[PDB]
C-alpha cells in the first residue's frame, strides 16, 4: 500500500536534507521536490514542502513558497507529516510545530542536529517533549545515512501501527474559546481539525474564508469586530506562553 508522507519544517532546519537522504533520486521549485523510496513492500511518496516559519497563504506574491506549503498542509491529504526541528534553534522552529499539531493531523516531530546541541552543553528531555506535544518525537541526524536508514523502519512501523495523537491543550481564553466553538460546526467535514479551521477563520485567513458562503463569511466577519482584544495579539500571546514554558522544562543549562 502506497503511503503519502509530507516533510515540512523551518528553512535550513534539515528538512531538505532528510528528504534527499530518504528518497535518493513545478512552479515553486525553490523547495517543491517529490521523491520515492520503498520499504517492506510498501511505497513512500514524499513531498518536500517549502521551508516556512508559520502558516500563511499568499496571492500577494513574495509569499508563493509559503502559500504553496500552507495550502498543502491544509488540503492535500497525507498519511503522516514529518516535521523536522533543529535543536539549536528549538524555540524558533516550534512555532510551526504548534500550528501543525493544532491541525490534529498524523504528525512525527523529527529532532535534527541533536549532536550539535550536546557540544553547546545543552541537554534535552525528548521524552518530556513528547508528552506535551502528544506526537511521536523522534531524534536523529539527517547527515548520518545510517541513522536515516533506521528512521525508515520506525516510520513504517509508526505508519502501519497508527500515529497516537494526544490533542494539545492550549486554552486561548474563554473569550476566544467561546467564539471558536461557535464556528466549529462549519468545518466538521474536513481533512484538518474543525477547531483549527475556526481559529484560522478568526485570524482572517482568507484561504479558509474563501470556502465559506457569503452569508457565513459575514457571520465570521462580525465575530472579529465584536471582541475586546485583537485576535492576532491574543492568539500570538497564548502561543508564546505555551512555547516558553515548554522550552524551559525540557531544556537544561549544563
Ligand atoms: Mg457573542
Ligand atoms: Mg465578499
Numbering used by the authors: 1 to 25, 33 to 261
From the paper:
For this bacterium, Feo is the primary system that transports Fe2+ into the cytosol. FeoA and FeoC are known to be small (ca. 7–10 kDa) cytosolic proteins, while FeoB is a large (ca. 80–100 kDa) polytopic transmembrane protein that contains an N-terminal soluble G-protein-like domain termed NFeoB. The status of GTP and GDP bound to the NFeoB region is hypothesized to control the opening and closing of the FeoB pore and therefore the translocation of Fe2+ into the bacterial cytosol.
To prepare the VcNFeoB NTPase domain for crystallization trials, we overproduced in Escherichia coli a previously designed construct that encodes for a non-cleavable (His)6-tagged version of the protein (i.e., VcNFeoB(His)6). Second, SEC of either crudely purified VcNFeoB(His)6 (IMAC only) or polished VcNFeoB(His)6 (after SEC) showed only the presence of a dominant monomeric species in solution, consistent with our previous in vitro studies on Feo proteins (from V. cholerae and others) recombinantly produced in E. coli. In order to characterize the three-dimensional structure of the VcNFeoB NTPase domain, we sought to crystallize the VcNFeoB(His)6 protein. This oligomerization is likely crystallization-induced based on our in-solution studies. We solved this structure by using molecular replacement coupled with model building and restrained refinement approaches (Rw/Rf = 0.210/0.268), and an analysis of the crystal contacts suggested that the (His)6 tag may have impacted the crystal quality.
